[PDB]
């Protein structure tokens, strides 16, 4: 496995693959149920149905394998050969490959300069082609044929004159004879009228034959290769009036002859000449033609692979006609399609054998073409081959495409043995790295291991008896199981697996019951609630696999979420409420036993059980030696005339017993905490622990925090009751006042004094004011001691507007299709909504549900796209070669006389490496190549620096991928990123995870469409696909004088750049709503009007730095609007990927095409080659395009084919004959080889192991 070369398969190659020829559509005898002879499923060509068993009853045993029996010809071997061997069908008349035609002109390529209609009408037998003309021969004998035609015309005119004379004599004779007869008054006139009518008719046929002669002669003179003759009779007249000069044909045979005689080199030369001097869309057509023709010229394969001659047939085992119980059958649709093509080929052969008409044989060849097209691609032209009529039949390409195709369903995502699934319950008593497995699942997962252990301990006699005993399920089996599961990791994994914390290793543990028990701390990492939720269990098998699950995937070494580098393994639903109730100031109860000091925390606890003291009460507490005091307590100390060191000795402190308990949960070396914990500060201290302590201490501290949190939440006594939620008394009064005002307004609307729209707007404003006021009143009313306050302030669960609409009135609710009702809901859920109020609330509830579902679907799609573009970017170098960095704003919004750090400094500059040192007072403050934390950021801000030069992946100059230092420290580990880590996948997953969480949309359209820009996940996917924004505001080209022309037809904005440069005229809508002054000075960077800037232009004029900054900021603010945060490196990797290619311009010396995408590295390479050669470099302009286009235009055709679009990418891969080098990730997941990312790297996997000599000397 070094390269999967792919290309056109010629007829000779297909013959070589085939081990025979398929001559019949027979499949199996209806009685014996065995394959027939030389048809489909034939053993003589594919292989023996039964292992080593031939067909005719002769050699029938494993011994004498590898021989052919002369009776039936079956070659005795393993039946598995039927899965490999493949045959072929010889077609009497060739056909065209449906793939390379009937598609985009990138794969068809205009190899023949004929429109798609011409091909569609010729290869389906509706018109002819002039395959070849002896034009030199026709020109050589021009005088002779011309003289012959002249003589033909002369004799035609002579005979016409004779006919005219005969007509005149007939007319005169009949007139004379009838006037002489005088049978009636005017017989002569009537007969003369008839005679002249006959003369006119004869003239009509004369001119008709003259016209036919002229048309056939001028079509003679209009001869040329590849000329289409739609009219069959006209073609026949061509053939009769002249032969041996023009050679013609119809159908695929004409295409085959044309391609055989095609001279692609001359076409390439002439097209190069045209491109040198050409204009308009003709240049683009010639460009595509040059691309395809040169792609064929460079590659060794001949173009004639377009028109196949022999059709391969899939090995029978892959299209099984498997027997079914009940006398019925199962057949795959390829059987039907192969039967159809074989039948039609047989009929064509029979029709050719006997002398048959042209019409029937041509229609038959067309039928064969349709059958082959249906075989490769059913449904690519007109109606599909519906077969039974209930559903379209499957075809070869259909199995290789789509969600259910092979690439995405049976190569990337496979089913796996040694696994299980069950509902999950919560187990608190477990430790952080433990998971409970019910008895049955554990016993079934570990069957091989339980068998081995049972045989080794002699509980079972032999292996089969061990199988029987485990199936029986005796107690000794369970004992052996309890012995065997331990020290063996199992990966628990939930279905969505949004980010890499989805799959987590655990220590298994037998447990009664039937549901997995899990540690509540890790549940929020999975987003796994306990309403009802099933989580799959997977088993690492190899020593390497279980080693990985021990080290890498362990549930205790993944405290930090990779999205932004914050703790994710300290959920808050219940424990945090316990801690908050524990570290709380006074007034939580009647603080009895307040204003006293206790000799040590033990005596304080004793007093607490006595009931004199309460947990929430300020008191002075001693601490034994070693208790590190509050960080702010350090400068204060006791009073003495001798030196004292209270940083690590006894010290009294005014705190609460609760805070003492909390701190003695934390490790001794951790400085004391004297502040209420809540949720934010708990995350802060957990992050500090994760930073400054080892992992084991972190896990133990988390476990102690968990236990205390549950215990003190139990004691917290949070409840809910009818009297718990007390509606504010003032509400009723205030609202009726509002109602008075409202009805007053209604009265003055009844007289027509106000328009309905104005009434609606003012009423909406009135009720928004009312609901804000009542929200504030309720906020003031509710005490701090009530359960809802305790569990909403602490950050346990809930949100202040939820209590607002549980206690205060709901307020304005959106009407269907994004309107606002005039009459908001005036009752809260405690009082109970009214009927219409409930109805209009459901109006918004159901819309929210549907929006949530659509957003999760789109988020999944976005995640897939991001992961698929972002692969290949692995860290493959310890250190960069360069020193260039990126300028970042360290501190902004600096108030007068002071320096204020940036509000969002964390996602921007934290976890980045300084390119170079910084000196502000002449002394070095932040040494080069150090990741940034709180201390350094505070010091640098205090020293007053305004910006920093942080190294980042964008400026990274690495010959192989990107270096570790440019990417800076990872975020899930808190240390420098190890070489070989998969940054691309982590970045994509971090981008995609909050897609479901965004769920933000414009509250109301406002009656105007196109004004408000796209909001939410649509905006994100727009930014990431290089889509022109819905509301696009053009940008100024340069400085100059700008003015407005308000033409009646449409508004218009004209700007003359300064310095005499060319005037530029930009169109705009009538409702421009611009802001730049008329006839005024303009700058290069400003935006002319309101809207969303177009990234392409920003790249074009400003620079790649500008577009990088713009995209990063835009997507970051879109995410921050909801509240989610992601680090900017995740965005930056994708952004560097989008900008990778460059559009070549002025491709004179470089000799390749102009105006096509080319990779940056390739551009630099070819420029170096041409400048070394002496030729001037071909120009290029950086180009930004969406992730989809970037992914499709990749060097590994296999990876792209595994992406959304399969047929086109495969087609151009074949036509280009491009071998897919196996560097990268997805394609090495297809093959099953080892991904070159992490443990799969060469440098990690080549090590050898041997102990030291002293180890052997000892023993």
Partner 1 sequence: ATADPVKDYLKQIGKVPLLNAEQEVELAKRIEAGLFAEDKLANSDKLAPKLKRELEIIAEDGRRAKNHLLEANLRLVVSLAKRYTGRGMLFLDLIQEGNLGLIRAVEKFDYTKGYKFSTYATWWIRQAITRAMADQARTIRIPVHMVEVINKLARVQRQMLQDLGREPTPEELAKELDMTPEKVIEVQKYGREPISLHTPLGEDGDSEFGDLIEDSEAVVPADAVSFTLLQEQLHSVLDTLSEREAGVVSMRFGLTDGQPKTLDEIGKVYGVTRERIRQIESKTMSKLRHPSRSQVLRDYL
The residues of the shown chain that bind Mg ion, judged by CB under 5 A, are 529, 533
In the list 155, 329, 800, 881, the residue contacting partner 1 (rule: CB under 8 A) is: 329
Q: Which residues are paired to 228 by β-bridges?
A: 129
- Among 1189, 1104, 568, which Cα is nearest to 869's? 1189
In the list 360, 412, 696, 1231, the residue contacting partner 1 (rule: CB under 8 A) is: 360
Q: How, if at all, do strands 419-426 and 516-518 pair? A: parallel
Please report how close the Cβ of residue 361 comes to partner 1 at its closest, in angstroms: 10
Cα distance between residue 152 and residue 135, in whole Å: 23
Nearer to Mg ion, 524 or 892 (CB): 524
Q: Which stretches does DSSP call E strand in 190-318?
A: 228-229, 246-249, 310-313
CA–centroid distance for 201 within its chain: 74
- Cβ–Cβ < 8 Å for 538, 416: yes
Please report how close the Cβ of residue 470 comes to partner 1 at its closest, in angstroms: 11
Please report how close the Cβ of residue 244 comes to partner 1 at its closest, in angstroms: 19
Q: What is the largest CA-CA distance in the chain?
A: 169
Q: Which stretches does DSSP call E strand in 800-905?
A: 814-815, 819-820, 886-889
CA–centroid distance for 1042 within its chain: 43
Long-range contacts of 1173-1176 (CB under 8 A, 24+ apart): 1175/1149, 1175/1150, 1176/1148, 1176/1149
Contacts of 297 (CB under 8 A, 6+ apart): 264, 265, 268
Rg (alpha carbons) of the chain, rounded to whole number: 42
- Binding of residue 46 to partner 1 (CB under 8 A): no
Residues numbered 457 to 516 that lie near partner 1 (CB under 8 A) are 461-465, 467
- Cβ–Cβ < 8 Å for 1184, 1026: yes
- Binding of residue 327 to partner 1 (CB under 8 A): yes
950 — phi, psi (to 5°)? Answer: -90, 130
Nearer to Zn ion, 59 or 711 (CB): 59
Please report how close the Cβ of residue 716 comes to Zn ion at its closest, in angstroms: 52
- Determine how many CB atoms are found less than 10 A away from the CB of residue 580: 27
Please report how close the Cβ of residue 259 comes to partner 1 at its closest, in angstroms: 20
Question: DSSP secondary-structure letter at 1101?
Answer: I
In the list 56, 62, 151, 476, the residue contacting partner 1 (rule: CB under 8 A) is: 62
For every residue of 25-80, which 3-state class applies, written as one string? CCCECCCCCCECCCCCCCCCCCCCCCCCCCCCCCCCCCCCCCCECCCCCCECCCHH
- Binding of residue 1146 to partner 1 (CB under 8 A): no
In the list 34, 50, 58, 1073, the residue contacting Zn ion (rule: CB under 5 A) is: 58
- Cβ–Cβ < 8 Å for 1007, 1098: no
Where is the binding site for Zn(2+), in residues? 54, 56, 69, 72, 880, 956, 963, 966
- Among 1076, 1075, 1078, which Cα is nearest to 1046's? 1078
- Cβ–Cβ < 8 Å for 1016, 1025: no
Cα pseudo-dihedral 511, 514, 518, 524, rounded to 10:
180
Give the range of 55-63, 502-510, 684-692, 1021-1029 binding partner 1 by CB under 8 A. Answer: 55-63
- Cβ–Cβ < 8 Å for 1026, 1157: no
Cα distance between residue 1041 and residue 1185, in whole Å: 32
Please report how close the Cβ of residue 524 comes to Mg ion at its closest, in angstroms: 12
Q: Which residues are paired to 1159 by β-bridges?
A: 1141
Indicate which of Zn ion, partner 1, Mg ion, none lies near residue 845 (CB less than 5 to 8 Å, by partner kind): none
- Binding of residue 347 to partner 1 (CB under 8 A): yes
Please report how close the Cβ of residue 463 comes to partner 1 at its closest, in angstroms: 5
- Binding of residue 845 to partner 1 (CB under 8 A): no
Please report how close the Cβ of residue 879 comes to Zn ion at its closest, in angstroms: 8
- Cβ–Cβ < 8 Å for 950, 936: no
Cα pseudo-dihedral 352, 356, 360, 364, rounded to 10:
-10
Indicate which of Zn ion, partner 1, Mg ion, none lies near residue 465 (CB less than 5 to 8 Å, by partner kind): partner 1
Q: How, if at all, do strands 510-511 and 246-249 pair? A: unpaired
- Cβ–Cβ < 8 Å for 68, 59: no
Cα distance between residue 1035 and residue 176, in whole Å: 95
Indicate which of Mg ion, partner 1, Zn ion, none lies near residue 761 (CB less than 5 to 8 Å, by partner kind): none
Indicate which of Mg ion, Zn ion, partner 1, none lies near residue 1054 (CB less than 5 to 8 Å, by partner kind): none
Question: DSSP secondary-structure letter at 421?
Answer: E
First to last CA, the chain: 44
DSSP per-residue string spanning 941-999: HHHT--EEEEE-GGG---SSSB-HHHH-B-SSSSSBPPTT-BHHHHHHHHHHTTHHHH-
- Cβ–Cβ < 8 Å for 1028, 1020: no
- Binding of residue 72 to Zn ion (CB under 5 A): yes
Query: Angle at CA 986, nearest 5°, toward 1136 and 1247?
Result: 100
Indicate which of Zn ion, Mg ion, partner 1, none lies near residue 72 (CB less than 5 to 8 Å, by partner kind): Zn ion
Indicate which of Zn ion, Mg ion, partner 1, none lies near residue 71 (CB less than 5 to 8 Å, by partner kind): Zn ion
Give the range of 319-327, 910-918, 1157-1165, 1231-1239 binding partner 1 by CB under 8 A. Answer: 319-327
Q: Angle of helix 800-807 relative to helix 756-781, nearest 10 degrees?
A: 100
- Binding of residue 842 to partner 1 (CB under 8 A): no
Nearer to Mg ion, 496 or 599 (CB): 496
Nearer to Mg ion, 100 or 526 (CB): 526
- Binding of residue 54 to Zn ion (CB under 5 A): yes
- Binding of residue 112 to partner 1 (CB under 8 A): no
Indicate which of Mg ion, Zn ion, partner 1, none lies near residue 339 (CB less than 5 to 8 Å, by partner kind): partner 1
In the list 333, 837, 993, 1128, the residue contacting partner 1 (rule: CB under 8 A) is: 333
Q: Give the contact letters, 399-428, x = binds to partner 1 (CB under 8 A), - = no.
A: ----xx------------------------
Nearer to Zn ion, 146 or 957 (CB): 957
Give the range of 387-395, 1002-1010, 1071-1079, 1103-1111 binding partner 1 by CB under 8 A. Answer: 387-395
In the list 336, 649, 703, 773, the residue contacting partner 1 (rule: CB under 8 A) is: 336
Nearer to partner 1, 335 or 616 (CB): 335
- Among 1129, 842, 1169, 779, which Cα is nearest to 987's? 1129
Nearer to Mg ion, 849 or 942 (CB): 849
- Cβ–Cβ < 8 Å for 969, 950: no
Please report how close the Cβ of residue 762 comes to Mg ion at its closest, in angstroms: 45
Q: Give the contact letters, 17-36, x = binds to partner 1 (CB under 8 A), - = no.
A: --------xxxxxxx----x
Q: Give the contact letters, 428-467, x = binds to partner 1 (CB under 8 A), - = no.
A: ---------------------------------xxxxx-x
Where is the binding site, in residues? 54, 56, 69, 72, 529, 531, 533, 880, 956, 963, 966
The two tokens of residue 14 are 């297909």
- Binding of residue 71 to Zn ion (CB under 5 A): yes
Residues numbered 867 to 926 that lie near Zn ion (CB under 5 A) are 880
Q: Give the contact letters, 964-1003, x = binds to Zn ion (CB under 5 A), - = no.
A: --x-------------------------------------
Please report how close the Cβ of residue 1209 comes to Zn ion at its closest, in angstroms: 31
Indicate which of Zn ion, Mg ion, partner 1, none lies near residue 476 (CB less than 5 to 8 Å, by partner kind): none
Nearer to partner 1, 22 or 521 (CB): 22
Q: How, if at all, do strands 503-506 and 310-313 pair? A: unpaired
Q: Which residues of this protein are in contact with partner 1, per CB under 8 A?
A: 25-31, 36, 61-63, 79, 120-121, 124-127, 320-322, 324, 327-333, 335-336, 339-340, 343-344, 347, 350-351, 354-357, 359-360, 363-364, 366-367, 370, 381-383, 387-388, 390-391, 393-394, 403-404, 461-465, 467
Q: Which residues of this protein are in contact with Zn ion, per CB under 5 A?
A: 54-56, 58, 69, 71-72, 880, 956, 958, 963, 966
């Amino acid at each position: 496995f070094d390269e999967l070369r792919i290309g056109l398969a010629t007829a000779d190659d297909i013959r070589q693959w085939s081990h025979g020829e398929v001559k019949k559509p027979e499949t199996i005898n209806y009685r014996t149920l065995k394959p027939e002879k030389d048809g489909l499923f034939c053993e003589k060509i594919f292989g023996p149905t039964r292992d080593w068993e031939c067909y005719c009853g002769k050699y029938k045993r494993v011994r004498f394998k590898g021989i052919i029996c002369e009776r039936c010809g079956v070659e005795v071997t393993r039946a598995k050969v039927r899965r490999e061997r493949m045959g072929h069908i010889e077609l009497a008349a060739p056909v065209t490959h449906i793939w390379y035609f009937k598609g985009v002109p990138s794969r068809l390529g205009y190899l023949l300069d004929l429109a798609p209609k011409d091909l569609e009408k010729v290869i389906y037998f509706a018109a002819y082609m002039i395959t070849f003309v002896d034009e030199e021969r026709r020109t050589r004998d021009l005088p002779s044929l011309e003289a012959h035609v002249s003589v033909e015309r002369q004799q035609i005119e002579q005979r016409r004159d004779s006919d005219l004379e005969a007509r005149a004599k007939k007319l005169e004779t009949d007139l004379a004879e009838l006037e002489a007869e005088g049978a009636k008054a005017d017989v002569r006139r009537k007969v003369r009228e008839g005679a002249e009518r006959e003369m006119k008719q004869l003239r009509d046929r004369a001119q008709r034959e003259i016209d036919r002669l002229d048309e056939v002669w001028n079509r003679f003179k209009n001869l040329k290769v590849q000329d289409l003759e739609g009219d069959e009779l006209l073609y026949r007249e061509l053939r009769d009036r002249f032969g041996t000069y023009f050679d013609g044909s119809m159908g695929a045979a004409a295409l085959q002859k044309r391609l055989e005689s095609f001279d692609l080199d001359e076409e390439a030369e002439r097209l190069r000449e045209i491109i040198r001097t050409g204009k308009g869309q003709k240049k683009t057509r010639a460009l595509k033609r040059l691309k395809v023709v040169s792609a064929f010229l460079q590659t060794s394969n001949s173009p004639k692979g377009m028109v196949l001659d022999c059709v391969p047939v899939i090995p029978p085992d892959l299209r099984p006609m498997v027997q079914l119980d009940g006398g019925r059958f199962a057949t795959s649709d390829l059987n039907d399609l192969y039967r159809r093509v074989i039948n039609r080929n047989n009929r064509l052969k029979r029709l050719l054998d006997l002398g048959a008409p042209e019409i029937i044989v041509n229609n038959e060849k067309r039928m064969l073409q349709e059958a082959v097209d249906a075989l490769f691609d059913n449904g690519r032209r007109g109606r599909p081959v519906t077969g039974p009529g209930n559903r379209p039949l499957k075809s070869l390409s259909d199995m290789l495409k789509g969600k259910q195709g092979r690439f995405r369903q049976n190569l990337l995502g496979k089913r796996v043995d040694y696994s299980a699934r069950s509902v999950i319950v919560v187990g608190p008593q477990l430790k952080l790295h433990q998971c409970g497995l019910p008895k049955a699942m554990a016993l079934e997962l570990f069957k091989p291991f339980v068998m081995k252990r049972l045989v080794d301990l002699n509980h079972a006699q032999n292996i089969k008896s061990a199988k029987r005993m485990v199936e029986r399920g005796r107690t000794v089996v369970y004992d052996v199981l309890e012995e065997v599961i331990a020290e063996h990791p199992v990966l628990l994994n939930r279905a969505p697996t949004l980010h890499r914390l989805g799959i987590q290793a655990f220590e298994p543990q037998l447990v009664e019951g039937k549901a997995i028990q899990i540690h509540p701390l890790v549940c929020t990492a999975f987003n796994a609630d306990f309403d009802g939720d099933q989580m799959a269990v997977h088993l690492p098998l190899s020593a390497e696999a279980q080693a990985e699950a021990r080290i890498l995937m362990l549930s205790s070494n993944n405290i930090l979420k990779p999205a932004d580098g914050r703790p994710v393994t300290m959920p808050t639903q219940d424990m945090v409420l316990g801690l908050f109730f524990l570290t709380t100031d006074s007034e939580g109860r009647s603080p009895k036993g307040e204003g006293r000091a206790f000799g040590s925390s033990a005596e304080a606890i004793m007093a607490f059980d006595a009931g004199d003291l309460t947990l929430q009460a300020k008191i002075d507490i001693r601490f034994p030696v070693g208790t590190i005091p509050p960080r702010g307590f350090e400068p204060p100390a006791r009073e003495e005339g001798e030196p004292e060191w209270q940083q690590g000795d006894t010290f009294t402190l005014k705190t609460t017993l609760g805070r003492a308990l909390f701190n003695e949960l934390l490790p001794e070396d951790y400085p004391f905490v004297d502040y209420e914990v809540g949720k934010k500060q708990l995350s802060e201290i957990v992050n500090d622990l994760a930073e400054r302590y080892p992992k084991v201490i972190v896990a133990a501290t988390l476990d102690n925090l968990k236990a205390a949190g549950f215990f003190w939440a139990t004691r917290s006594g949070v409840t809910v009751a009818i009297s718990d939620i007390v509606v504010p008394d003032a509400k009723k009064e205030i609202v009726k006042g509002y109602e008075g005002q409202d009805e007053k307004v209604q009265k003055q609307y009844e007289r027509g004094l106000i328009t309905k729209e104005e009434r609606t707007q003012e009423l909406i404003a009135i009720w928004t004011k009312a609901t804000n006021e009542v929200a504030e009143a309720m906020n003031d009313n509710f005490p701090k001691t009530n359960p809802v306050s305790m569990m909403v302030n602490s950050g346990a669960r809930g949100n202040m507007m939820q209590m607002r609409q549980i206690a205060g009135m709901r307020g304005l609710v959106s009407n269907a299709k994004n309107e606002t009702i005039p009459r908001p809901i005036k009752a809260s859920f405690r009082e109970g909504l009214s009927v219409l109020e409930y109805f209009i609330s459901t109006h918004g509830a159901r819309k929210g549900l549907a929006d949530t579902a659509l957003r999760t679907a789109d988020s999944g799609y976005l995640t897939r796209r991001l992961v698929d573009v972002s692969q290949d970017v692995i860290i493959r170098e310890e250190d960069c070669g360069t020193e260039r960095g990126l300028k970042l704003p360290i501190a902004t919004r600096d108030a007068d006389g002071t320096l204020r750090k940036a509000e969002d400094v964390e996602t921007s500059v934290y976890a980045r490496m300084l390119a170079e040192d910084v000196v502000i007072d002449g002394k070095v403050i932040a040494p080069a190549n150090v990741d940034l934390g709180d201390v350094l950021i505070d010091a640098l801000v205090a020293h007053g620096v305004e910006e920093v030069k942080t190294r980042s992946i964008l400026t990274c100059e690495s010959q192989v991928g990107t270096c570790a230092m440019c990417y800076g420290r990872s975020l899930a580990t808190g240390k420098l990123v190890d070489i070989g880590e998969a940054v691309g996948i982590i970045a994509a997953q971090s981008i995609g995870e909050p897609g479901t969480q965004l769920t933000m949309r414009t509250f109301h359209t406002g009656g105007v469409a196109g004004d408000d820009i796209t909001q939410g996940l649509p905006r994100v996917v727009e930014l990431f696909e290089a889509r022109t924004p819905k509301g696009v505001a053009p940008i100024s080209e340069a400085s100059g004088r700008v003015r407005i022309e308000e033409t009646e037809k449409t508004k218009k904005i004209v700007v003359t750049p300064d310095d005499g440069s060319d005037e530029t005229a930009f169109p705009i809508s009538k409702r421009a709503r611009l802001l730049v002054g008329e006839g005024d000075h303009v700058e290069v960077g400003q935006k002319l009007t309101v809207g969303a800037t177009n990234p392409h232009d920003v790249l074009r004029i400003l620079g790649q730095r500008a577009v990088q900054v713009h995209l990063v900021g835009e997507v970051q603010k879109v995410y921050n609007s909801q509240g989610v945060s992601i680090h900017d490196k995740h965005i930056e990797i994708i952004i560097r990927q989008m900008l990778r290619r460059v559009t070549i311009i002025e491709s004179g010396d470089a000799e390749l095409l102009p105006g096509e995408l080319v990779e940056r590295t390739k551009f630099e390479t070819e420029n170096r080659r041409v400048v070394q050669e002496g030729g001037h470099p071909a120009s290029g302009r950086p180009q930004l395009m969406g992730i989809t286009k970037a992914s499709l235009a990749t060097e590994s055709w296999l990876s792209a084919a595994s992406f959304q679009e399969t047929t086109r990418v495969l087609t151009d891969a074949a036509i280009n004959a491009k071998s897919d080098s196996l560097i990268g990730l997805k394609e090495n997941v297809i093959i099953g080889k080892l991904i070159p990312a992490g443990t799969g790297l060469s440098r990690y996997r080549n090590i050898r192991v041997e102990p030291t000599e002293e180890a052997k000397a000892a023993m």
